[PDB]
Amino acid sequence: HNFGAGPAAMAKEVIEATAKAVNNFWEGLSILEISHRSKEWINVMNETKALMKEVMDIPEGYEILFFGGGASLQFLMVAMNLLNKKACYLDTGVWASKAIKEAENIGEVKIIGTSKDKNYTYIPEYQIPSDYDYFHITTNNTIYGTEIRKDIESPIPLVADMSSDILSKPIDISKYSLIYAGAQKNCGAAGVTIVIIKKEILGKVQRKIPIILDYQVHILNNSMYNTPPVISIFTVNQTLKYIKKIGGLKKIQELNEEKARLLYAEIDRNKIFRGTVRKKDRSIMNVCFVMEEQYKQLENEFSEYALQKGIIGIKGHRSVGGFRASIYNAVTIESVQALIKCMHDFEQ
Amino acid sequence: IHNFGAGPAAMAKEVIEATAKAVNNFWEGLSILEISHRSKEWINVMNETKALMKEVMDIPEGYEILFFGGGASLQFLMVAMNLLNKKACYLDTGVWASKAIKEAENIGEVKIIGTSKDKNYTYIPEYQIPSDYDYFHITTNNTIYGTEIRKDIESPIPLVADMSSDILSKPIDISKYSLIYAGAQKNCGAAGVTIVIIKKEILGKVQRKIPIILDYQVHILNNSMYNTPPVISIFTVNQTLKYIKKIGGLKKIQELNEEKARLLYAEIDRNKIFRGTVRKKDRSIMNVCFVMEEQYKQLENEFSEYALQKGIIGIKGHRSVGGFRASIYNAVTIESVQALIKCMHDFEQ
Ligand SMILES: Cc1ncc(COP(=O)(O)O)c(C=O)c1O
Ligand SMILES: Cc1ncc(COP(=O)(O)O)c(C=O)c1O
Ligand SMILES: [Cl-]
Ligand SMILES: [Cl-]
Numbered sequence: 001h002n003f004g005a006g007p008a009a010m011a012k013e014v015i016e017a018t019a020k021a022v023n024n025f026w027e028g029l030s031i032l033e034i035s036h037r038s039k040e041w042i043n044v045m046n047e048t049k050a051l052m053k054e055v056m057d058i059p060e061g062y063e064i065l066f067f068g069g070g071a072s073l074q075f076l077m078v079a080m081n082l083l084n085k086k087a088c089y090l091d092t093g094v095w096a097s098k099a100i101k102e103a104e105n106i107g108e109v110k111i112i113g114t115s116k117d118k119n120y121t122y123i124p125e126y127q128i129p130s131d132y133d134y135f136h137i138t139t140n141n142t143i144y145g146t147e148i149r150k151d152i153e154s155p156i157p158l159v160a161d162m163s164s165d166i167l168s169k170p171i172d173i174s175k176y177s178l179i180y181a182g183a184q185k186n187c188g189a190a191g192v193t194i195v196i197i198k199k200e201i202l203g204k205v206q207r208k209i210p211i212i213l214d215y216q217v218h219i220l221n222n223s224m225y226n227t228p229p230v231i232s233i234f235t236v237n238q239t240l241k242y243i244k245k246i247g248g249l250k251k252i253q254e255l256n257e258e259k260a261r262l263l264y265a266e267i268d269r270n271k272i273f274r275g276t277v278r279k280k281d282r283s284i285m286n287v288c289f290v291m292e293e294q295y296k297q298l299e300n301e302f303s304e305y306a307l308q309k310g311i312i313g314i315k316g317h318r319s320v321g322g323f324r325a326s327i328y329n330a331v332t333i334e335s336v337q338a339l340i341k342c343m344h345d346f347e348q
Numbered sequence: 349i350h351n352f353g354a355g356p357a358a359m360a361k362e363v364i365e366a367t368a369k370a371v372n373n374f375w376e377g378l379s380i381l382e383i384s385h386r387s388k389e390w391i392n393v394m395n396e397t398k399a400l401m402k403e404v405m406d407i408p409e410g411y412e413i414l415f416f417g418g419g420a421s422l423q424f425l426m427v428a429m430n431l432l433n434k435k436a437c438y439l440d441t442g443v444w445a446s447k448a449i450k451e452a453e454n455i456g457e458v459k460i461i462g463t464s465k466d467k468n469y470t471y472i473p474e475y476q477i478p479s480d481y482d483y484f485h486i487t488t489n490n491t492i493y494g495t496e497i498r499k500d501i502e503s504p505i506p507l508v509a510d511m512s513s514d515i516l517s518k519p520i521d522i523s524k525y526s527l528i529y530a531g532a533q534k535n536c537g538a539a540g541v542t543i544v545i546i547k548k549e550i551l552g553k554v555q556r557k558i559p560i561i562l563d564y565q566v567h568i569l570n571n572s573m574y575n576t577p578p579v580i581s582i583f584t585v586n587q588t589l590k591y592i593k594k595i596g597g598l599k600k601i602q603e604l605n606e607e608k609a610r611l612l613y614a615e616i617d618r619n620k621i622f623r624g625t626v627r628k629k630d631r632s633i634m635n636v637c638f639v640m641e642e643q644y645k646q647l648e649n650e651f652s653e654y655a656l657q658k659g660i661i662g663i664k665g666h667r668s669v670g671g672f673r674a675s676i677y678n679a680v681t682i683e684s685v686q687a688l689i690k691c692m693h694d695f696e697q
Contacts, residue, residue, distance in 0.1 A: 004384050007579065015379045021367045028349050030364045032538040032584065035353050035662065068417030068540060069561070072575035076559045105559050184576055189381035191417065191540045191578030210425045210454050211447075212418070226421035227533055229540030230356065231580055235381060313384065 001335040004313035005142060005286065006164070006185035009330040013245075014188070014238040021231070031234055036227055045222065048237040055243050058173045058196060065195040065215070065223045066233050071095075071163050071182040074193060075102035078136065078159050078178060081215045083107040084205045088132040088156075092148075093120045093141035094319070095161060103136070119320070120144040122278040130155045133204075134177070140165030142185075143317040145288030145324065146281045151175045157201045165285045166194070167243065168329060169253035177201050186285075186328045188235035192228070243329075252329055259327050259336045260284040266340045270347055272296060276320060290322030298322055302346060309342045350684040353662035354491060354635070355513070355534040358679040362594075363537070363587040370580070380583055385576050394571065397586040404589055404597055407522050407545060414544040414564070414572045415582050420444075420512045420531040423542060424451035427485065427508050427527060430564045432456040433554045437481040437505075441497075442469045442490035443668065444510060452485070468669070469493040472630040479504045482553070483526070489514035491534075492666040494637035494673065495630045500524045506550045514634045515543070516592065517678060518602035526550050534634075535677050537584030541577075592678070601678055608676050608685045609633040615689045619696055621645055625669060639671030647671055651695060658691045 002009040024031035025040060034041055049064045058064070067073065079087065079102060087107065089100045091114040103109045112135075113126030123146050128135050134157045140147040142164040149169075152158060157177030166181035173179070177198045184190040195215070202216050211217055211225075218225050243252060264282060267275045267289045274292040277283070291298040302323070306314060316324040327336060351358040373380035374389050383390055398413045407413070416422065424447060428436065436456065438449045440463040452458045462475035472495050477484050483506045489496040491513040498518075501507060506526030515530035522528070527546045533539035544564070551565050560566055560574075567574050592601060613631060616624045616638045623641040626632070640647040651672070655663060665673040676685055 002378065002382065004382070006576070007382055007384060010379065010382050015370060015381060018370050018381070021364060021370055026349075029351065030359065032364060032367070033351065033353070033356055033359050035356060036539065068419065068542075068578065069422065070417060070575045073418065073561050076561050102560055182576060189580055190385065190576050191581055193417075211451055212422050212425050226419040227355070227531060227539050229417065229578060229581065231538055232540055232578065 001311050001338050002313060003311065003325045003327065003331065003335070003339070005324065005326040006182070007190050008185055008326060008328045010189070011239070011242045011330050014235060014242050017238040017241075018235060020234060032231055034230070036224055036230055041230060044234065044237055045224065048233060048240065051237070051240040051244065052196075055240055055248055056167070056173060056196075057170070061198060061200060062173060063197050063199045063219050065197060065218050066228050066236070067193045067195060067218070067223075068191065068229050070193050071161055071180055072098070074161070074180040074195065075099045076106070077213050077215065078134075078180070079103040079106040080209050080213050081205060082134045082157065082159070082178070082201060084133045086110065086132050087134050087136065088112050088129060089136045090124075090126055090138070091116060092123055092138055092144075092146060094143045094317070095141060095163070096138040099136060099138065099161060115146070120146065121276055122146065123148055123281040128154050128156060132156050134159055134201075136160070140283055140285050142286050142326075143324075144320055145277045145283045145286045147283035147285065149284065157198070165283070167249065167252070168256055168285055170249040183232060183236055188239045189232050192232035192236060194236070255333065256284050256327070256329065259331065259333060260287065262340060263287050263325060263327065263336055266343055270343050272302065272347055273323075273343060276322065285326065285328055287325040287327060288316060288320055288322065289325075290316070290320070302343075305346055306339075306342055309338075311339055311342055314339070350660050350687050351662055352660065352674045352676065352680065352684070352688070354673065354675040355531065356539050357534055357675055357677045358684075359538070359584075360588070360591050360679045362591050363584060366587045366590075367580075367584060369583060381580055383579065385573055385579060390579065393583065393586055394573070397582060397589065400586065400589040400593065401545075404592055405516065405520065405522060405545075410547055410549060411522060412546050412548045412568045414546060414567050415577050415585070416542045416544060416567070417540065417578050419542050420510055420529055421447070423510070423529040423544065424448045425455070426562050426564065427483075427529070428452040428455040429554075429558055429562050430551060431483045431506070431508070431527070431554060433482050435459065435481050436483050436485065437461050437478060438485045439473075439475055439487070440465060441472055441487055441495055442493045443666070444491060444512070445487040448485060448487060448510060464495070469495065470625055471495065471627040472497055477503055477505060481505050483508050485509070489632055489634050491635050491675075492673070493669055494626050494632040494635045496632035496634065498633065506547070514632075516598065516601070517605055517634055519598040532581060532585055534675075537588045538581050541581035541585060543585065604682065605633050605676070605678065608680065608682055609636065611682075611689060612636050612674060612676065612685050615692055619692050621651070621696055622672075622692065625671065634675065634677060636674040636676060637665060637669055637671065638674075639665075639669070654695055655688075655691055658687075660688050660691055663688070
């Protein structure tokens, strides 16, 4: 039962469909052999966009882009492209802090809100100033298990790292001005990073941008200004095809809110363990819980027993400590329930 | 089917097969595309992949091996940001060298000490490397024009080289190079990873301005996993190195490639429907460009459609040079080269 935090569990169909490492419709040639300038690859790029557009209900005026280099690279690109004079951020955890520290290296960043004080266990109240160039959030804070589940109304363009909770439920794209997400958690395999960007926001920055970091260039060249990560992109295509096949994001959410409901319920009733985050702000993707009072013991005791019973990748981040159950889309109800019983049977 | 694609390109079958890890990498039971990059399983493969690379290419101590996303094209920026303190010098031997220059120029003062532009990049120009510049950048094999610098250069200033098209195509004295980078998708493995071998000594000499994600020093410190790397692409590199080693290492590779090129250049020369575009001396062993002779006999359809019919793919040239281009990287076999030879020959009207 893989609760890995990213890369993570993946729907079998999607891993199997990637039999295109063996024969893609070249004909006869591996997907890893085919030219990205081939009409065969171009179709797949268009097809993947079309589907993404369909699945996420992306309105006209937004462009879809596939980049290597991970979300971490995007921390820089959003800043270089949209931080003209001043930008504002919301510090809800490690990834958010990383985003900020990058932005701070390119221009003036104002952190309007921070949950640092109480160790990132909650999502802080904040006010978005209307005179800043853009507002950046981190929808789901993968390490702490906090999440902003409602789409936000900004007056300034909204930018959101959804690495951990993109494609986990339906959303109003029209509120976001730039969404980006490493593929490796919910979208697909590592090695590609997705950017859905409202092209309108772009050319407003004073002048200083390298060609390779310039959203406008990539857009111009249909995300193939240079050689994209074909194989990873192909996982995204398949993953989108899967989501669609199983009722799209509406059904996805049902499965995810149930998975998260049951798991939070367990932690709450079971009194070996205690959840770390404020109920109201609980993540539906990354579920963090610690030993209860105390040390009863985390040590070895919950962990080794879990391992034995087949539960992998639930050890928490060093900073929060304790445990973390990453339950992305591909993580099944059965597995969550396997971890529920594991926790329950451990109860002494 | 004979794949002369320019990148991505032909790949050894063992390497595409080995990538059965998509189905089941160690784990146990989990796909390579599911495994954590922090896992001890993946960390071994990174180390193994470095160790092998170090072994195959004979990398001396002091040099750090790094896998990046984003292509060589990102590397165009990164070298400049990381090494261009006050002034740099570059050698314009074609499209890719030009692209490298234009990026560098966006960061700081760049001097182009040499250019083969004048005669449409058909030759490699004479040059003198100033000892006072922060680094010298070259593009060893000019993938679009079919020129190549086959001998390793002695700088004084640190040498930087885009070997996308001819890395791992023969042995080389790494000690002459200060920073090597190459997109994987031509000789090293699948697209989606870009390799960097860099002499860490050269680094911290730049004033001061570098984003975390673009900082070779940061990536070095975190063993190339500061952020999530391209697991699957990296794997293909691990396998490709394994394959190279398996077949006698770079020494044997060179033998195959030089013969492949010789035979094909020999056909182009004898056959007088076609004519090679580049000065013999500077002929690329990796990317072989030829045009119709005199003229238009006709490139048109005539050589092209017939070739397609006969199973030859990806030989159509770049728009700028026109004509044709036969990319014959490591994974391209002597059989394929000879099948294209015969096609050309039999077509002799
Ligand atoms: C919310 C969030 N943003 C960004 C990232 C960074 O992803 P990458 O490794 O592609 O930089 C992560 C990685 O886990 C994450 O959880
Ligand atoms: C010499 C050279 N440089 C740069 C590139 C660009 O690689 P990418 O598109 O991955 O940046 C190529 C691609 O073929 C190449 O042969
Ligand atoms: Cl976080
Ligand atoms: Cl070139």
